[PDB]
Amino acid sequence: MTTSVFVSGATGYLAQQIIALVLSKGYKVVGSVRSEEKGANLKKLYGDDFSYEVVKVLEQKGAFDEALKKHPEVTIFLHTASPVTFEVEDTEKEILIPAINGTKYVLQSIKDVAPQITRVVYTSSVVAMSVPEELGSPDVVLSEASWSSLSYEQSKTHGVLAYFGSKQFAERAAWEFVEQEKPNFALSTVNPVYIFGPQAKDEEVKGTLNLSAEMVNSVLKLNKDDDVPATTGTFIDVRDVAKAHLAAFEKDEAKGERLLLSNTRFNGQTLLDVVRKNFPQLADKLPVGKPHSDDFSAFKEWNDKKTKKILGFEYFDFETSVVDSIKQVLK
């Protein structure tokens, strides 16, 4: 009485949608944020059931020790935070190692300081399951068993491969920790694809008119002469990813599982067609392309049947997710 959930990286896009849902379920949340001011801001948004602790360097050894000691009422840990960066100076030092080590140290801290925690959900990614070329191939079927074959070496060589590799090796480290250190908690992971959808709080749409569904605000900043963005892949709505995190710690079936969070396929045309129909006023400063020339019928469906069975709910569709994102930005 009652149940308190720890959410790392509480200011995050997906993190706040998680927090919103979890609070709606009557849970309490203890969020980690990078500064007192970030904490105060969430507290104003979320109310009495929300509290926070300040953890500046999440990848540092023993980083979460103090915040965990101060909260023995915490029995669930949602590890959603991932390293904030830009400067591709040394990918190893600044991306690979922090992600790996950070995952180790956070789990190590839960064992050392929070033995009452019974469930840990690690937010991973589909990039842990595959390589960029395979993500766009119609012959590829990913499942909960899929692991990226990207090597450590090649994962150093570029910003994108670095982000791919960091998520792969971090998630491998998490499972390895469960195998080796045998903690009191059951681990599960959520592995989302391209995330679309509105933010949890209107007050957080800032800077004004910018979309956290990043692929969306990329097309919104188009000129009526630009090409159609050739980006493509599968999408999932942030509220669905949020609902998967809840299931990931509430349901017994989710223990020791990886949950592939992936809905339908899209490209730039798919996005344009939706934006243009639902927001006509924006169409004169947008390109037309070739409406509905997007044809994904040859792509084999990914195997997420296990995940869908565990979750037991139906997903938001592409248009609804996109329309909700934009509708909120326009308020």
mmCIF file of C-alpha atoms in Angstrom:
data_model
loop_
_atom_site.group_PDB
_atom_site.id
_atom_site.type_symbol
_atom_site.label_atom_id
_atom_site.label_comp_id
_atom_site.label_asym_id
_atom_site.label_seq_id
_atom_site.Cartn_x
_atom_site.Cartn_y
_atom_site.Cartn_z
ATOM 1 C CA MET A 1 0.000 0.000 0.000
ATOM 2 C CA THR A 2 0.335 1.510 -2.393
ATOM 3 C CA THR A 3 2.629 0.667 -5.308
ATOM 4 C CA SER A 4 5.462 3.044 -6.219
ATOM 5 C CA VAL A 5 7.199 2.903 -9.608
ATOM 6 C CA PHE A 6 10.642 4.361 -10.384
ATOM 7 C CA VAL A 7 10.975 5.872 -13.870
ATOM 8 C CA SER A 8 14.473 6.923 -14.982
ATOM 9 C CA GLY A 9 14.745 9.821 -17.464
ATOM 10 C CA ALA A 10 11.334 11.119 -16.396
ATOM 11 C CA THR A 11 11.337 14.192 -18.668
ATOM 12 C CA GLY A 12 11.451 11.992 -21.777
ATOM 13 C CA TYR A 13 8.800 11.831 -24.494
ATOM 14 C CA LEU A 14 8.047 8.123 -23.919
ATOM 15 C CA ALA A 15 8.812 8.436 -20.200
ATOM 16 C CA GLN A 16 6.050 10.992 -19.651
ATOM 17 C CA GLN A 17 3.518 8.934 -21.529
ATOM 18 C CA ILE A 18 4.518 6.059 -19.264
ATOM 19 C CA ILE A 19 4.195 8.273 -16.178
ATOM 20 C CA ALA A 20 0.767 9.563 -17.276
ATOM 21 C CA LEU A 21 -0.606 6.030 -17.708
ATOM 22 C CA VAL A 22 0.967 4.645 -14.568
ATOM 23 C CA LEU A 23 -0.400 7.546 -12.490
ATOM 24 C CA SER A 24 -3.813 6.945 -14.088
ATOM 25 C CA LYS A 25 -3.674 3.435 -12.692
ATOM 26 C CA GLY A 26 -3.287 4.603 -9.102
ATOM 27 C CA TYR A 27 0.435 3.946 -8.836
ATOM 28 C CA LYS A 28 2.913 6.402 -7.397
ATOM 29 C CA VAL A 29 5.921 7.456 -9.458
ATOM 30 C CA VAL A 30 9.433 8.359 -8.388
ATOM 31 C CA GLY A 31 11.135 9.954 -11.388
ATOM 32 C CA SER A 32 14.814 10.601 -12.020
ATOM 33 C CA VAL A 33 15.614 13.910 -13.740
ATOM 34 C CA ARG A 34 18.878 15.697 -14.563
ATOM 35 C CA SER A 35 18.141 18.861 -12.540
ATOM 36 C CA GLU A 36 15.941 20.095 -9.662
ATOM 37 C CA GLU A 37 14.175 22.447 -12.044
ATOM 38 C CA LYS A 38 13.188 19.589 -14.396
ATOM 39 C CA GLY A 39 11.815 17.766 -11.360
ATOM 40 C CA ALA A 40 9.799 20.761 -10.145
ATOM 41 C CA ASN A 41 8.290 21.137 -13.590
ATOM 42 C CA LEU A 42 7.050 17.514 -13.759
ATOM 43 C CA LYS A 43 5.736 17.738 -10.207
ATOM 44 C CA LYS A 44 3.627 20.715 -11.234
ATOM 45 C CA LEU A 45 2.311 18.725 -14.213
ATOM 46 C CA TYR A 46 1.689 15.425 -12.439
ATOM 47 C CA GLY A 47 0.739 16.223 -8.853
ATOM 48 C CA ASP A 48 1.086 14.642 -5.417
ATOM 49 C CA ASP A 49 1.595 11.045 -6.537
ATOM 50 C CA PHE A 50 4.737 12.137 -8.389
ATOM 51 C CA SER A 51 8.075 12.734 -6.717
ATOM 52 C CA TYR A 52 11.593 12.929 -8.078
ATOM 53 C CA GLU A 53 15.253 12.547 -7.317
ATOM 54 C CA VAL A 54 18.127 14.211 -9.182
ATOM 55 C CA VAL A 55 20.528 11.929 -11.037
ATOM 56 C CA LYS A 56 22.907 13.923 -13.211
ATOM 57 C CA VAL A 57 25.168 11.285 -14.750
ATOM 58 C CA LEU A 58 23.123 8.162 -15.364
ATOM 59 C CA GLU A 59 26.025 6.117 -16.738
ATOM 60 C CA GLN A 60 28.184 6.723 -13.665
ATOM 61 C CA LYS A 61 28.917 3.884 -11.240
ATOM 62 C CA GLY A 62 26.550 3.962 -8.245
ATOM 63 C CA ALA A 63 24.569 6.833 -9.783
ATOM 64 C CA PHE A 64 21.182 5.582 -8.587
ATOM 65 C CA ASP A 65 22.374 4.405 -5.151
ATOM 66 C CA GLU A 66 21.206 7.481 -3.236
ATOM 67 C CA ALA A 67 17.879 7.885 -5.021
ATOM 68 C CA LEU A 68 17.094 4.198 -4.384
ATOM 69 C CA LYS A 69 18.097 4.281 -0.682
ATOM 70 C CA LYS A 70 15.780 7.273 -0.203
ATOM 71 C CA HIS A 71 12.847 5.236 -1.554
ATOM 72 C CA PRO A 72 12.323 1.793 0.080
ATOM 73 C CA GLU A 73 8.654 2.037 -0.965
ATOM 74 C CA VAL A 74 9.739 1.439 -4.580
ATOM 75 C CA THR A 75 9.165 -2.107 -5.899
ATOM 76 C CA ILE A 76 9.114 -1.500 -9.677
ATOM 77 C CA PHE A 77 11.854 0.071 -11.820
ATOM 78 C CA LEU A 78 11.214 1.346 -15.369
ATOM 79 C CA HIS A 79 14.585 2.092 -16.950
ATOM 80 C CA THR A 80 13.664 4.305 -19.915
ATOM 81 C CA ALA A 81 16.531 6.797 -20.029
ATOM 82 C CA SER A 82 19.134 6.715 -22.799
ATOM 83 C CA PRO A 83 22.325 8.860 -23.172
ATOM 84 C CA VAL A 84 21.781 12.445 -24.370
ATOM 85 C CA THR A 85 24.457 13.329 -27.000
ATOM 86 C CA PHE A 86 25.412 14.960 -30.312
ATOM 87 C CA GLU A 87 29.188 15.232 -30.546
ATOM 88 C CA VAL A 88 30.434 12.217 -32.489
ATOM 89 C CA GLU A 89 34.007 12.840 -31.290
ATOM 90 C CA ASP A 90 34.730 9.392 -29.816
ATOM 91 C CA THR A 91 31.771 7.047 -30.360
ATOM 92 C CA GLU A 92 33.193 4.357 -28.089
ATOM 93 C CA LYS A 93 33.926 6.607 -25.090
ATOM 94 C CA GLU A 94 30.830 8.709 -25.562
ATOM 95 C CA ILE A 95 28.179 6.332 -26.860
ATOM 96 C CA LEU A 96 29.047 2.616 -26.714
ATOM 97 C CA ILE A 97 30.699 2.504 -23.269
ATOM 98 C CA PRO A 98 28.237 4.822 -21.475
ATOM 99 C CA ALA A 99 25.246 2.852 -22.749
ATOM 100 C CA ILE A 100 26.743 -0.519 -21.823
ATOM 101 C CA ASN A 101 28.249 0.510 -18.477
ATOM 102 C CA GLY A 102 25.240 2.574 -17.537
ATOM 103 C CA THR A 103 22.920 -0.397 -17.968
ATOM 104 C CA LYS A 104 25.231 -2.545 -15.817
ATOM 105 C CA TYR A 105 25.548 0.070 -13.052
ATOM 106 C CA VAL A 106 21.819 0.783 -12.897
ATOM 107 C CA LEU A 107 21.014 -2.920 -12.524
ATOM 108 C CA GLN A 108 23.910 -3.295 -10.089
ATOM 109 C CA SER A 109 22.416 -0.431 -8.056
ATOM 110 C CA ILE A 110 19.005 -2.050 -7.900
ATOM 111 C CA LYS A 111 20.462 -5.284 -6.580
ATOM 112 C CA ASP A 112 22.754 -3.518 -4.085
ATOM 113 C CA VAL A 113 20.304 -0.967 -2.712
ATOM 114 C CA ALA A 114 16.793 -1.999 -3.709
ATOM 115 C CA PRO A 115 16.332 -5.750 -3.085
ATOM 116 C CA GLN A 116 12.605 -5.088 -2.576
ATOM 117 C CA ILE A 117 12.270 -4.315 -6.311
ATOM 118 C CA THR A 118 10.553 -7.255 -8.002
ATOM 119 C CA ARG A 119 10.302 -6.055 -11.614
ATOM 120 C CA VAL A 120 12.693 -4.198 -13.932
ATOM 121 C CA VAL A 121 11.600 -3.106 -17.389
ATOM 122 C CA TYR A 122 14.402 -1.947 -19.686
ATOM 123 C CA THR A 123 13.407 0.241 -22.638
ATOM 124 C CA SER A 124 15.348 -1.196 -25.561
ATOM 125 C CA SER A 125 14.701 -0.765 -29.285
ATOM 126 C CA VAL A 126 14.215 -2.576 -32.588
ATOM 127 C CA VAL A 127 17.729 -1.420 -33.521
ATOM 128 C CA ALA A 128 18.936 -4.014 -30.997
ATOM 129 C CA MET A 129 17.249 -6.652 -33.162
ATOM 130 C CA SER A 130 18.565 -5.780 -36.600
ATOM 131 C CA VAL A 131 20.759 -3.700 -38.914
ATOM 132 C CA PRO A 132 19.588 -0.699 -40.968
ATOM 133 C CA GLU A 133 19.451 -2.555 -44.284
ATOM 134 C CA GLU A 134 17.352 -5.380 -42.800
ATOM 135 C CA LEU A 135 14.847 -2.946 -41.322
ATOM 136 C CA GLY A 136 13.777 -1.919 -44.817
ATOM 137 C CA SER A 137 13.808 -5.310 -46.472
ATOM 138 C CA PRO A 138 10.566 -7.049 -47.551
ATOM 139 C CA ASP A 139 12.224 -10.461 -47.006
ATOM 140 C CA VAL A 140 13.026 -9.814 -43.347
ATOM 141 C CA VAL A 141 10.797 -11.096 -40.554
ATOM 142 C CA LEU A 142 11.820 -9.878 -37.096
ATOM 143 C CA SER A 143 10.506 -11.476 -33.866
ATOM 144 C CA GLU A 144 11.101 -11.320 -30.124
ATOM 145 C CA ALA A 145 14.080 -13.634 -30.757
ATOM 146 C CA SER A 146 15.818 -11.294 -33.254
ATOM 147 C CA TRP A 147 19.266 -9.961 -32.386
ATOM 148 C CA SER A 148 21.272 -7.533 -34.481
ATOM 149 C CA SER A 149 24.372 -9.085 -36.001
ATOM 150 C CA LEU A 150 26.137 -5.696 -35.932
ATOM 151 C CA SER A 151 29.617 -6.139 -34.435
ATOM 152 C CA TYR A 152 31.274 -4.027 -31.754
ATOM 153 C CA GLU A 153 33.959 -2.862 -34.208
ATOM 154 C CA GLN A 154 31.604 -1.715 -36.971
ATOM 155 C CA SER A 155 29.352 -0.157 -34.351
ATOM 156 C CA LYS A 156 32.162 2.307 -33.551
ATOM 157 C CA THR A 157 32.457 3.546 -37.129
ATOM 158 C CA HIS A 158 29.546 5.946 -37.520
ATOM 159 C CA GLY A 159 26.832 7.793 -35.606
ATOM 160 C CA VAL A 160 23.946 5.590 -36.770
ATOM 161 C CA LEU A 161 25.726 2.279 -36.330
ATOM 162 C CA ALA A 162 26.876 3.551 -32.935
ATOM 163 C CA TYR A 163 23.288 4.124 -31.877
ATOM 164 C CA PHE A 164 22.348 0.690 -33.234
ATOM 165 C CA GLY A 165 25.250 -1.024 -31.436
ATOM 166 C CA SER A 166 24.852 0.846 -28.160
ATOM 167 C CA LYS A 167 21.254 -0.387 -27.843
ATOM 168 C CA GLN A 168 22.218 -3.934 -28.833
ATOM 169 C CA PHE A 169 25.081 -4.242 -26.329
ATOM 170 C CA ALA A 170 23.231 -2.461 -23.554
ATOM 171 C CA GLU A 171 20.318 -4.900 -23.855
ATOM 172 C CA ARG A 172 22.700 -7.887 -24.016
ATOM 173 C CA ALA A 173 24.327 -6.556 -20.855
ATOM 174 C CA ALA A 174 20.951 -6.370 -19.109
ATOM 175 C CA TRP A 175 20.084 -9.995 -19.825
ATOM 176 C CA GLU A 176 23.640 -11.048 -18.980
ATOM 177 C CA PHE A 177 23.309 -9.338 -15.617
ATOM 178 C CA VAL A 178 20.155 -11.345 -14.879
ATOM 179 C CA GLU A 179 21.935 -14.562 -15.843
ATOM 180 C CA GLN A 180 25.138 -13.823 -13.949
ATOM 181 C CA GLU A 181 24.089 -11.814 -10.872
ATOM 182 C CA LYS A 182 20.741 -13.600 -10.323
ATOM 183 C CA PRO A 183 18.839 -10.587 -8.850
ATOM 184 C CA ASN A 184 15.521 -10.678 -6.973
ATOM 185 C CA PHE A 185 13.754 -8.963 -9.885
ATOM 186 C CA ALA A 186 12.347 -10.345 -13.110
ATOM 187 C CA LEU A 187 13.593 -8.416 -16.155
ATOM 188 C CA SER A 188 11.667 -7.664 -19.307
ATOM 189 C CA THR A 189 12.308 -5.360 -22.276
ATOM 190 C CA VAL A 190 10.236 -3.239 -24.634
ATOM 191 C CA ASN A 191 11.641 -2.901 -28.153
ATOM 192 C CA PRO A 192 9.873 -0.160 -30.063
ATOM 193 C CA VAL A 193 10.159 0.919 -33.690
ATOM 194 C CA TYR A 194 9.682 4.490 -35.050
ATOM 195 C CA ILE A 195 7.620 6.175 -32.362
ATOM 196 C CA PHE A 196 4.785 8.534 -33.300
ATOM 197 C CA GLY A 197 2.037 10.103 -31.208
ATOM 198 C CA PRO A 198 1.217 13.130 -29.048
ATOM 199 C CA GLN A 199 3.022 14.095 -25.859
ATOM 200 C CA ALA A 200 1.519 13.345 -22.446
ATOM 201 C CA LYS A 201 1.016 17.006 -21.484
ATOM 202 C CA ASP A 202 -0.029 19.948 -23.656
ATOM 203 C CA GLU A 203 2.136 22.153 -21.420
ATOM 204 C CA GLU A 204 5.166 20.216 -22.693
ATOM 205 C CA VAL A 205 4.682 21.142 -26.335
ATOM 206 C CA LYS A 206 7.624 23.559 -26.249
ATOM 207 C CA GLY A 207 9.161 24.819 -28.365
ATOM 208 C CA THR A 208 5.737 25.708 -29.798
ATOM 209 C CA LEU A 209 4.778 23.845 -33.024
ATOM 210 C CA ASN A 210 7.514 21.181 -32.716
ATOM 211 C CA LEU A 211 6.588 17.485 -32.788
ATOM 212 C CA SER A 212 8.194 14.842 -30.550
ATOM 213 C CA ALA A 213 6.992 12.350 -33.120
ATOM 214 C CA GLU A 214 10.199 13.386 -34.900
ATOM 215 C CA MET A 215 9.452 11.957 -38.353
ATOM 216 C CA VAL A 216 6.307 14.108 -38.394
ATOM 217 C CA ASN A 217 7.857 17.525 -37.737
ATOM 218 C CA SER A 218 10.478 16.610 -40.336
ATOM 219 C CA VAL A 219 7.808 16.541 -43.051
ATOM 220 C CA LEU A 220 5.977 19.562 -41.634
ATOM 221 C CA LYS A 221 9.099 21.618 -42.341
ATOM 222 C CA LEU A 222 8.827 20.974 -46.077
ATOM 223 C CA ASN A 223 8.583 23.336 -49.028
ATOM 224 C CA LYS A 224 6.071 22.695 -51.805
ATOM 225 C CA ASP A 225 9.000 21.844 -54.106
ATOM 226 C CA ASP A 226 10.977 19.435 -51.909
ATOM 227 C CA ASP A 227 11.099 15.711 -52.580
ATOM 228 C CA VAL A 228 9.028 13.242 -50.594
ATOM 229 C CA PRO A 229 11.158 11.964 -47.672
ATOM 230 C CA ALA A 230 12.213 8.474 -48.669
ATOM 231 C CA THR A 231 12.441 7.304 -45.051
ATOM 232 C CA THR A 232 10.444 4.165 -44.384
ATOM 233 C CA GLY A 233 9.933 1.522 -41.738
ATOM 234 C CA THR A 234 7.328 0.522 -39.216
ATOM 235 C CA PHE A 235 5.662 2.747 -36.666
ATOM 236 C CA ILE A 236 4.174 2.326 -33.193
ATOM 237 C CA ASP A 237 2.157 4.862 -31.176
ATOM 238 C CA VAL A 238 3.842 6.130 -28.005
ATOM 239 C CA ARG A 239 0.703 5.376 -25.975
ATOM 240 C CA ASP A 240 0.925 1.733 -27.134
ATOM 241 C CA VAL A 241 4.604 1.584 -26.142
ATOM 242 C CA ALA A 242 3.551 3.066 -22.811
ATOM 243 C CA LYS A 243 0.857 0.432 -22.404
ATOM 244 C CA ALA A 244 3.454 -2.243 -23.177
ATOM 245 C CA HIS A 245 5.639 -1.016 -20.307
ATOM 246 C CA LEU A 246 2.735 -1.368 -17.896
ATOM 247 C CA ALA A 247 2.027 -4.934 -19.082
ATOM 248 C CA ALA A 248 5.770 -5.589 -18.902
ATOM 249 C CA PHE A 249 5.697 -5.306 -15.123
ATOM 250 C CA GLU A 250 2.064 -6.166 -14.281
ATOM 251 C CA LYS A 251 1.667 -9.472 -16.129
ATOM 252 C CA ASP A 252 3.309 -12.771 -15.157
ATOM 253 C CA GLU A 253 3.581 -13.798 -18.815
ATOM 254 C CA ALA A 254 5.892 -10.824 -19.429
ATOM 255 C CA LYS A 255 8.611 -12.086 -17.060
ATOM 256 C CA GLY A 256 11.888 -12.701 -18.889
ATOM 257 C CA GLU A 257 10.357 -11.597 -22.190
ATOM 258 C CA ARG A 258 11.322 -9.204 -24.949
ATOM 259 C CA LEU A 259 8.331 -7.345 -26.375
ATOM 260 C CA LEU A 260 8.521 -6.257 -29.998
ATOM 261 C CA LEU A 261 6.467 -3.061 -30.329
ATOM 262 C CA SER A 262 5.847 -2.573 -34.036
ATOM 263 C CA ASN A 263 2.674 -1.781 -35.996
ATOM 264 C CA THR A 264 2.232 -0.991 -39.684
ATOM 265 C CA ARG A 265 4.646 0.077 -42.438
ATOM 266 C CA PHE A 266 4.956 3.653 -43.798
ATOM 267 C CA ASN A 267 7.131 5.925 -45.906
ATOM 268 C CA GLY A 268 7.255 9.659 -46.672
ATOM 269 C CA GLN A 269 4.280 9.421 -49.028
ATOM 270 C CA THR A 270 2.248 7.621 -46.364
ATOM 271 C CA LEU A 271 2.911 10.491 -43.985
ATOM 272 C CA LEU A 272 2.263 13.256 -46.547
ATOM 273 C CA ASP A 273 -1.027 11.768 -47.682
ATOM 274 C CA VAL A 274 -2.271 11.723 -44.110
ATOM 275 C CA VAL A 275 -1.069 15.210 -43.235
ATOM 276 C CA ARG A 276 -2.475 16.751 -46.407
ATOM 277 C CA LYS A 277 -5.982 15.232 -45.992
ATOM 278 C CA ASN A 278 -6.408 15.990 -42.304
ATOM 279 C CA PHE A 279 -4.768 19.421 -42.341
ATOM 280 C CA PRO A 280 -5.748 21.085 -45.660
ATOM 281 C CA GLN A 281 -4.466 24.495 -44.550
ATOM 282 C CA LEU A 282 -0.954 23.037 -44.553
ATOM 283 C CA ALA A 283 -1.165 21.565 -48.026
ATOM 284 C CA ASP A 284 -0.120 24.661 -50.010
ATOM 285 C CA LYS A 285 3.279 24.732 -48.324
ATOM 286 C CA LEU A 286 3.684 20.947 -48.705
ATOM 287 C CA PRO A 287 4.623 18.792 -51.705
ATOM 288 C CA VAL A 288 2.084 16.403 -53.224
ATOM 289 C CA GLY A 289 4.282 13.533 -54.376
ATOM 290 C CA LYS A 290 2.314 10.625 -55.826
ATOM 291 C CA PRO A 291 -0.610 9.989 -53.406
ATOM 292 C CA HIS A 292 -1.036 6.339 -52.370
ATOM 293 C CA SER A 293 1.819 5.151 -54.552
ATOM 294 C CA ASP A 294 3.108 3.554 -51.344
ATOM 295 C CA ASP A 295 2.704 -0.213 -51.649
ATOM 296 C CA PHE A 296 3.911 -2.437 -48.836
ATOM 297 C CA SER A 297 2.033 -5.594 -49.770
ATOM 298 C CA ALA A 298 5.254 -7.453 -50.592
ATOM 299 C CA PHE A 299 6.812 -6.990 -47.155
ATOM 300 C CA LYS A 300 6.461 -10.148 -45.060
ATOM 301 C CA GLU A 301 4.723 -9.411 -41.786
ATOM 302 C CA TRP A 302 7.006 -9.326 -38.760
ATOM 303 C CA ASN A 303 6.432 -11.967 -36.103
ATOM 304 C CA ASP A 304 5.157 -10.116 -33.002
ATOM 305 C CA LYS A 305 2.407 -12.660 -32.272
ATOM 306 C CA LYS A 306 3.897 -13.555 -28.875
ATOM 307 C CA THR A 307 4.014 -9.863 -27.871
ATOM 308 C CA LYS A 308 0.452 -9.163 -29.065
ATOM 309 C CA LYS A 309 -0.724 -12.186 -27.072
ATOM 310 C CA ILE A 310 0.956 -10.968 -23.931
ATOM 311 C CA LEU A 311 -0.268 -7.359 -24.282
ATOM 312 C CA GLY A 312 -3.853 -8.242 -25.197
ATOM 313 C CA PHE A 313 -4.837 -4.900 -26.686
ATOM 314 C CA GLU A 314 -5.265 -3.451 -30.164
ATOM 315 C CA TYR A 315 -2.888 -0.763 -31.487
ATOM 316 C CA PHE A 316 -3.577 2.825 -32.598
ATOM 317 C CA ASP A 317 -3.457 3.051 -36.386
ATOM 318 C CA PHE A 318 -1.001 5.231 -38.355
ATOM 319 C CA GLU A 319 -3.398 8.051 -39.269
ATOM 320 C CA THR A 320 -4.784 8.363 -35.745
ATOM 321 C CA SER A 321 -1.303 8.477 -34.231
ATOM 322 C CA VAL A 322 -0.147 11.148 -36.727
ATOM 323 C CA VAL A 323 -3.378 13.164 -36.576
ATOM 324 C CA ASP A 324 -3.276 13.190 -32.753
ATOM 325 C CA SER A 325 0.326 14.455 -32.806
ATOM 326 C CA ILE A 326 -0.393 17.337 -35.125
ATOM 327 C CA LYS A 327 -3.779 18.208 -33.590
ATOM 328 C CA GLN A 328 -2.099 18.858 -30.262
ATOM 329 C CA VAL A 329 0.734 20.921 -31.744
ATOM 330 C CA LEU A 330 -1.875 23.133 -33.414
ATOM 331 C CA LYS A 331 -3.637 23.940 -30.125
#
